CSV table of C-alpha atoms in Angstrom, one decimal:
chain,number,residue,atom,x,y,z
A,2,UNK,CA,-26.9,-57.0,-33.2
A,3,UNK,CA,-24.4,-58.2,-30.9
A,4,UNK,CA,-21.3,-59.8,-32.0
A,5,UNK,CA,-18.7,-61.5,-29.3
A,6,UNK,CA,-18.0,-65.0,-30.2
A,7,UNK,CA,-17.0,-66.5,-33.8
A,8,UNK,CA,-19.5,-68.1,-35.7
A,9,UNK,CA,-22.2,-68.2,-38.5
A,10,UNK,CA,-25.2,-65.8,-37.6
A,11,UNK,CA,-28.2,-65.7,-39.8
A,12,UNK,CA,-30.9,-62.6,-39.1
A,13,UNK,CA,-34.0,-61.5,-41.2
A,14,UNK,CA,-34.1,-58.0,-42.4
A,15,UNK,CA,-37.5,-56.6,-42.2
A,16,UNK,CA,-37.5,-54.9,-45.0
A,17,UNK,CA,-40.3,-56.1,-47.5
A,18,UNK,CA,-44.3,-55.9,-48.3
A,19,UNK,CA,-46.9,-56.3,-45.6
A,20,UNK,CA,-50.0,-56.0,-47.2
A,21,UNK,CA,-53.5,-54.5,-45.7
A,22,UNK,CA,-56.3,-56.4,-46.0
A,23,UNK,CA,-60.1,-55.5,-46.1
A,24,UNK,CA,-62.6,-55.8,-43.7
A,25,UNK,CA,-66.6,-57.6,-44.3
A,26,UNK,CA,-69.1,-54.9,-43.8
A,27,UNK,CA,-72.1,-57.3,-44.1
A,28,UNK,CA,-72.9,-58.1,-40.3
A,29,UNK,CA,-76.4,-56.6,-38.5
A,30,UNK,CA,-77.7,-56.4,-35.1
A,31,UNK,CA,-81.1,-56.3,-34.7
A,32,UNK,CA,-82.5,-55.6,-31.2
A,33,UNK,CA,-85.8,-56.3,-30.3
A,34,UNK,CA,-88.8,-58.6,-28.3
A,35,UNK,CA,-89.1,-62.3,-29.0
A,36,UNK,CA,-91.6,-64.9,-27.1
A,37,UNK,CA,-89.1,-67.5,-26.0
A,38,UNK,CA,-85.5,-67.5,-26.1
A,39,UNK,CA,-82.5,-65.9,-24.3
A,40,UNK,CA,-82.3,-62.9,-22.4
A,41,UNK,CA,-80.2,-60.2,-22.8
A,42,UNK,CA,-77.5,-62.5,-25.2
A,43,UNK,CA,-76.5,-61.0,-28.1
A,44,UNK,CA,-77.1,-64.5,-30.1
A,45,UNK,CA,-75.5,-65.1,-33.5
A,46,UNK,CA,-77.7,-66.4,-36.7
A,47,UNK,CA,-76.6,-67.1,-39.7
A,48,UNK,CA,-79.6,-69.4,-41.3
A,49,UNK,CA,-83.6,-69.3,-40.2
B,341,UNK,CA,-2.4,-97.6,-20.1
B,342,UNK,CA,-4.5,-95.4,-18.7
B,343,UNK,CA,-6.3,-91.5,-19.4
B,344,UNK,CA,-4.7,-88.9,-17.9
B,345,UNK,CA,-5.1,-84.9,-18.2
B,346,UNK,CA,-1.6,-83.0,-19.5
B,347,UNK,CA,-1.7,-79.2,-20.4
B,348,UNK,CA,-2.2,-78.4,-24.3
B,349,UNK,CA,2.0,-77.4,-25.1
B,350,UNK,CA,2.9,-79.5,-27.7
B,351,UNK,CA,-0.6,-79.8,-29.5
B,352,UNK,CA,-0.6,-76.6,-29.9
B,353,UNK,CA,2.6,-76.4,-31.2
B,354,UNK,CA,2.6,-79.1,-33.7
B,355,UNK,CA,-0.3,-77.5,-35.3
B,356,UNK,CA,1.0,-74.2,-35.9
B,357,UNK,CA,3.5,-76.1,-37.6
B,358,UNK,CA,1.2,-77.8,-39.4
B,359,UNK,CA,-0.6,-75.2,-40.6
B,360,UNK,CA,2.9,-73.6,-41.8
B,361,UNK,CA,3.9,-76.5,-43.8
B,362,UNK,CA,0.7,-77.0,-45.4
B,363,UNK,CA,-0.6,-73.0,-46.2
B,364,UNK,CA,1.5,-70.1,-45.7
B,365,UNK,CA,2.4,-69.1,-41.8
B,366,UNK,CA,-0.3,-65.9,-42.9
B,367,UNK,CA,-3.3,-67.9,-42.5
B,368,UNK,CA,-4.2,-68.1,-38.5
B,369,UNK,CA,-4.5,-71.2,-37.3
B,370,UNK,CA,-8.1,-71.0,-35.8
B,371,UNK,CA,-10.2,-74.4,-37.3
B,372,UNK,CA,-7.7,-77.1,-36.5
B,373,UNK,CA,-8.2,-80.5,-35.0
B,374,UNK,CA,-6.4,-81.9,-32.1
B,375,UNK,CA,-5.4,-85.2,-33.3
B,376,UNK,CA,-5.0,-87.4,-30.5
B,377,UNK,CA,-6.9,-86.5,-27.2
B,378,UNK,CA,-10.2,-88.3,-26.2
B,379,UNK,CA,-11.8,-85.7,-23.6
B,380,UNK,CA,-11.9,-82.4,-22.1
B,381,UNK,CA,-13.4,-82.4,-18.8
B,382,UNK,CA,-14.5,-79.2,-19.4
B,383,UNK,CA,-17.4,-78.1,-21.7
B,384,UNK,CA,-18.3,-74.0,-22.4
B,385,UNK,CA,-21.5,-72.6,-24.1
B,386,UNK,CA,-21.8,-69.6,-26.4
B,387,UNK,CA,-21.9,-67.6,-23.3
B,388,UNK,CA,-18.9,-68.7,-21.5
B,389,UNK,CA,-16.8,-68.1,-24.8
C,487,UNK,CA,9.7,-45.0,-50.8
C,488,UNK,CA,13.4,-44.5,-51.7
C,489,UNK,CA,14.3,-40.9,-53.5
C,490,UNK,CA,15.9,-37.5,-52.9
C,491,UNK,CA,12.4,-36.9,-51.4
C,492,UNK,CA,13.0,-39.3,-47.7
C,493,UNK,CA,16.7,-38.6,-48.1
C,494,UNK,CA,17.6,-35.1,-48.2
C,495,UNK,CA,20.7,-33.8,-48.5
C,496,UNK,CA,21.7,-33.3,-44.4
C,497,UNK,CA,20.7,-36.8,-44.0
C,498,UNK,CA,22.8,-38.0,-46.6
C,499,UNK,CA,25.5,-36.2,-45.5
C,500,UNK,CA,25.8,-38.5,-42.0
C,501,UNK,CA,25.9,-41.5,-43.9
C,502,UNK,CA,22.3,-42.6,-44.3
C,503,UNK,CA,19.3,-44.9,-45.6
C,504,UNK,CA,15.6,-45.2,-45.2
C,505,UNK,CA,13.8,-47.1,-47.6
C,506,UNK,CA,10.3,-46.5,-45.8
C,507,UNK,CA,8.0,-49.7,-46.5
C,508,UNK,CA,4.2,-49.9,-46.0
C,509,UNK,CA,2.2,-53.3,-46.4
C,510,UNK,CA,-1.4,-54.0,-45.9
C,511,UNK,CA,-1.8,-57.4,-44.2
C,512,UNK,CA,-5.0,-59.8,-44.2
C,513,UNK,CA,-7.1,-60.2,-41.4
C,514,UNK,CA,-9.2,-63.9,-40.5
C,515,UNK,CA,-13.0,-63.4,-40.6
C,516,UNK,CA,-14.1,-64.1,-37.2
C,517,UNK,CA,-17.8,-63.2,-37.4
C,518,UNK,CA,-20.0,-64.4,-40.7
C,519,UNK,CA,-23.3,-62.4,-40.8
C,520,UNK,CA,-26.2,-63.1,-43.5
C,521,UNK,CA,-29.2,-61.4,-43.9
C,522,UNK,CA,-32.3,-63.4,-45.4
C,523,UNK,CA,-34.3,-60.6,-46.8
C,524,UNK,CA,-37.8,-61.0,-47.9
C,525,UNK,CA,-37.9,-58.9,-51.8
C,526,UNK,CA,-40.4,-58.3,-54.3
């Protein structure tokens, strides 16, 4: 850092943990033909 | 009975003294108060200094 | 200092003294600086 007037100066060294973290791996897409409905949207269900 | 502006000679000068009679002339008089002025007309930001 | 060593004999012999000093004064802190560190 700079220093070039007299004060207090309080900084974070970024030294520590940063911990990784998982993904979810339970998401399908199923592509296919339906009577009604919209076209060509990739529509998101989560209950029938 | 009126405010006036007068260059900072004496203040200065009477604290230096105090500071010698009250520590030892080795500590630098840096943080000291200038008893009896009201204003500056003059203000400076971190930059400035 | 003050010994045969800073006053040799030629020196002596003109008439003088050297009594070298060294002091190490204090300094004001100007700038305070912390850190704040994040630690497990």
């Amino acid at each position: 850092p700079s220093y070039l007037s007299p004060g207090v100066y309080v900084e974070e060294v970024a030294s520590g943990s940063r911990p990784i973290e998982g993904v979810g791996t339970s998401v399908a897409a199923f592509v296919g033909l339906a009577p009604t409905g919209p076209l060509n949207e990739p529509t998101l269900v989560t209950n029938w | 009975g009126q405010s006036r502006l007068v260059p900072p000679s004496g203040h200065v000068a009477g604290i230096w003294a105090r500071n010698d009679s009250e520590r030892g002339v080795h500590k630098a008089p840096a943080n000291e108060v200038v008893r009896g002025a009201v204003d500056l007309e003059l203000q400076i930001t971190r930059g400035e200094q | 200092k003050c010994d045969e060593e800073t006053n040799p004999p030629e020196s002596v012999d003109l008439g003088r003294v050297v009594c070298e000093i060294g002091i190490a004064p204090v300094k004001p802190a100007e700038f305070v600086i912390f850190r704040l560190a994040q630690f497990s």
